[PDB]
């Protein structure tokens, strides 16, 4: 609903033959790059390949990120699209290669069938039974609970393990409550009071809920979407048991941990069981590393091994930089800011500047996307920028010009409202002239160097 830099992008706008329509799905031009991005979408949808690298190469403002977000829409919601900047990699909690691995496994999805095996009923009896321990000093301990559950199809009496009674107790269950018990986890939920004895005069603000219809014991099945990283985090910070470690692990502050290769390898074995059991579909996705020049030579040297993994997502890099110094490696310059070792691994999709008529087309697509009804002379004015100034400066003027026009009572933006927008809101280059002319000498009114 809110309008942002890419709201006009809907897809790659390809034909069924995989040729790009010169203006489609919000794009103008980049056709060869949109066609290359189509073949990458085909590489992703065909699950067979792991750890292929793509680099979107091209100057700033050439639509590299629009291409990546268009890929994210051609893949649709089912496939994991995992966007990060290279500046997100420097965590204070864990080594930066941990964050890369977390993002690699976040980009691999799993859809898995799960059977939840549960008891539901109104608690009609609850009777604890206990033992006098030998002198351990903590005193007597509850040995078991007997609990009666009533549903619509009769009732059942449960002799609970005291580990499950601790779930019942920390859930503050009472006689006459309706509860859900999940035998998968031993976990408990108090659903409410019964709608029986649902008198109004409680300060407790109870939710009275109807007696569970059906059998008191149920075995529902549901389909869960999870990533491999979701499993890593679940097994590294255990929280689903009723044991003391799981219990205290919900009271401690959450913190990221450098999950070992040993854990990740053994979760591959677990997930492959789900595949062989036929309860899971593996759905590998894509990791978009934007601003990949902000990675460093340790990140890039780790990515070598990470991409060689027998399962890894597709990685799409984007970079906007020429021959530049590699970060963390001030001795080494290379094109794109990517090490010459790593660049050999990628397929480079070069991305090119727009022509003036393409800028005019983009300005009109962008204007109507924002709902800026804009006259043709006003379109031509805005498209003189983008040629003489960055393309982004065109698109950013459309909103001020709309405000100024409507403040002038106009229904639509004239050349006048842009010419005022051009004056209130400078480009970087005109501001850079103001600096060099005003800061031409120091003083009270000078700019600070």
């Amino acid at each position: 609903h809110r309008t942002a830099a890419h709201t006009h992008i809907k897809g790659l706008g390809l034909n069924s033959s995989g040729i790009a329509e010169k203006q489609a799905a919000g794009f103008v031009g980049q056709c060869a790059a949109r066609e290359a991005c189509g073949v990458v979408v085909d590489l992703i949808k065909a699950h067979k390949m792991a750890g292929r690298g793509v680099l979107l190469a091209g100057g700033p403002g050439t639509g590299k990120t629009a291409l990546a977000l268009a890929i994210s829409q051609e893949l649709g919601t089912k496939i994991p699209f995992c966007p990060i900047t290279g500046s997100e990699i420097y965590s204070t909690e864990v080594k930066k290669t941990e964050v890369l691995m977390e993002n690699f496994r976040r980009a691999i999805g799993l859809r898995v069938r799960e059977t939840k095996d549960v008891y539901e009923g109104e608690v009609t009896e609850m009777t604890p039974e206990e033992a006098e321990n030998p002198l351990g000093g903590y005193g007597k301990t509850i040995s078991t609970l007997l609990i009666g559950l009533k549903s619509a199809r009769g009732q059942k009496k449960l002799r609970l393990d005291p580990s499950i009674y601790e779930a019942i107790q920390k859930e503050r269950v009472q006689v006459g409550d309706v509860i859900y018990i999940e035998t998968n986890t031993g976990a408990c939920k108090r659903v409410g009071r019964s709608d029986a004895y649902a008198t109004e005069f409680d300060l407790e603000a109870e939710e009275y809920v109807p007696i569970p219809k059906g059998e008191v014991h149920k075995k529902k099945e549901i389909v869960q979407d999870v990533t491999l990283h979701d499993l890593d985090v679940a097994n590294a910070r255990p929280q689903g048991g009723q044991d003391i470690i799981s219990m205290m692990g919900q009271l401690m502050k959450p913190k990221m941990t450098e999950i070992t290769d040993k854990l990740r390898m053994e979760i591959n074995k677990v997930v492959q069981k789900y595949i062989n059991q036929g309860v899971a579909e593996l759905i590998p996705g894509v990791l978009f590393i934007d601003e990949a020049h902000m990675l460093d030579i340790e990140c890039f040297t780790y990515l070598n091994k990470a991409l060689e993994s027998p399962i890894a997502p597709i990685v799409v890099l984007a970079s906007n930089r020429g021959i530049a110094t590699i970060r963390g490696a001030d001795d080494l310059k290379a094109a794109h800011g990517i090490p010459p070792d790593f660049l050999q691994r990628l397929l480079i999709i070069p991305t090119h500047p727009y022509e003036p008529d393409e800028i005019r087309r983009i300005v009109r697509i962008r204007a109507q996307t924002e709902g800026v009804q804009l006259t043709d002379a006003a379109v031509d004015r805005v498209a003189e920028h983008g040629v003489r100034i960055s393309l982004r400066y065109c698109l950013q003027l459309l909103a001020p010009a709309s405000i100024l026009a409507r403040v002038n009572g106009r229904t639509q933006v004239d050349v006048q409202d842009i010419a005022e927008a051009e004056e209130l809101f400078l480009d970087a280059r005109r501001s850079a002239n103001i600096l060099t002319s005003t800061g031409e000498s120091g003083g009270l009114h000078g700019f600070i160097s």
Partner: protein, 441 residues
């Protein structure tokens, strides 16, 4: 107290035409910049467009912060306005990227509405039953209006509140049934005399009228950051306030973004996007700029406003200079506002407002001399001399600040340029950049 910007009470523009008045709402001059900030201010209020970065640029002083403070006053309390100094981002508890993510998400409000239900009545009786050696408690509250009596059962949480509030018969109380909070409004009976230590007798009140229960629609605004913190945790929601929150995982934010959209479609919530003002933005690193530039591109990005004093200046964390000290591919995404140094009549009008805000009665010649000082020493220094001259005038019991007091203040307190000469005139006795010094006479 009176602070550096306490006189700024708005942007000073005609709400219809966005024409800046030459002086109103405490702002003076900067008309081109104030109109530009008024167009930004309107596209903030409209909410429609996300992720606009506007840089306010100018030499030191010339009101760039004052303009940003005028915008904040004109939005009022409801729209979020997250002030951030760029030096806050260099946390030891979280990365710069996470610190920026939190600062963005602090700037988007979720405005959530609920129907509470409340009670208003005289307590006729209280019964509480307590298990010896603790554990369970039970009780009944008998509560009254002119028109109803009813007996409500009480749980332990309510009995704790009742006893903490020391509720007694003849109290008038209200209970928010949804939150469970209690407040004593007063008493309808006298305070008794049979017991000691009953404490303060609260306000006399007539008994409440009407029904005991009343529904009450209430609205609460919470940030996306506050939703993040409590949904990344089971326990420890004080991290909203103590700042103990770590680097929150992106799975939690992706879920929250999806749910807040759903809450908007459900009509449960209104999203109210506000402003992140990054002052001193030149203090960020290249790594921070290469995060903001793509953080802006999201549908939930706030409007970002920045201020820089810097010329063509070195970017932090790299080897090279750029305008404003900001990377060019960052400035590509920015529309820039330029503020201009004030004229003497603008200086005079500002100093008159500062004098009026501090409640200082300048003589006309003192205002003239402060204006002359303002031209040569600066607006901040000439402002500092106003309060200083008021104090000096009070020493001599003067009813107004005379020229003698401004001259006395000018004598006692050096301006920056005069202090720089004083340093240059004492290079032997101050510690040099070589660390050498001479202590002798």
């Amino acid at each position: 107290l009176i602070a550096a910007h306490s006189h700024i009470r708005g942007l000073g523009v005609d709400a219809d035409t966005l024409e800046p008045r030459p002086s109103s709402q405490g702002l003076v001059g900067q008309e081109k910049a104030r109109k530009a900030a008024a167009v930004v201010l309107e596209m903030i209020k409209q909410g429609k467009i996300a992720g606009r970065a506007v840089l306010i640029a100018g030499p030191p002083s010339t009101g760039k912060t004052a303009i940003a403070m005028g915008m904040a006053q004109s939005l009022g309390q409801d729209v979020p306005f997250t002030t951030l100094a760029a030096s806050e981002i260099f946390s030891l508890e979280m990365s710069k990227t996470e610190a920026l993510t939190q600062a963005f998400r602090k700037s988007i409000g979720v405005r959530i509405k609920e129907e509470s239900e409340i009670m208003e009545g005289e307590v006729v009786e209280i019964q509480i039953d307590r298990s010896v050696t603790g554990g369970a408690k039970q009780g009944k509250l008998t509560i009254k209006t002119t028109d109803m009596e009813a007996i409500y059962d009480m749980g332990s949480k309510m009995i704790d509140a009742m006893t903490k509030e020391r509720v007694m018969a003849g109290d008038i109380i209200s209970i928010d049934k949804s939150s469970g909070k209690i407040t004593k409004l007063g008493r309808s009976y006298a305070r008794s005399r049979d017991y000691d230590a009953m404490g303060v007798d609260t306000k006399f009140l007539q008994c409440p009228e009407g029904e005991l229960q009343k529904r009450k629609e209430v609205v609460h605004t919470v940030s996306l950051h506050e939703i993040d913190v409590i949904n990344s945790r089971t326990q420890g929601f004080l991290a909203l306030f103590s700042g103990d929150t770590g680097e929150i995982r992106s799975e939690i934010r992706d879920q929250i973004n999806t749910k807040v959209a759903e809450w908007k479609e459900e009509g449960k919530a209104e999203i109210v996007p506000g402003v992140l003002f990054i002052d001193e933005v030149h203090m960020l690193d290249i790594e921070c700029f290469s995060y903001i530039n793509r953080a802006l591109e999201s549908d939930l990005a706030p409007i970002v406003i920045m201020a820089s004093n810097r010329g063509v200046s070195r970017i932090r964390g790299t080897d090279y200079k750029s305008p404003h000290g900001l990377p060019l591919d960052f400035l590509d995404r920015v529309v820039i506002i330029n503020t201009h140094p004030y004229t003497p009549d603008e200086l005079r009008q500002i100093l008159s407002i500062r004098a009026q805000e501090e409640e200082v009665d300048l003589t006309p010649d003192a205002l003239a001399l402060l204006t002359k000082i303002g031209q040569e020493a600066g607006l901040r220094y000439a402002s500092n001399l106003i309060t200083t001259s008021q104090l000096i005038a009070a020493k001599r019991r003067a009813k107004q600040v005379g020229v003698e007091d401004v001259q006395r203040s000018f004598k006692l307190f050096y301006d920056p340029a005069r202090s720089v000469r004083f340093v240059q005139e004492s290079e032997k006795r101050l510690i040099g950049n070589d660390g050498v010094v001479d202590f002798s006479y």
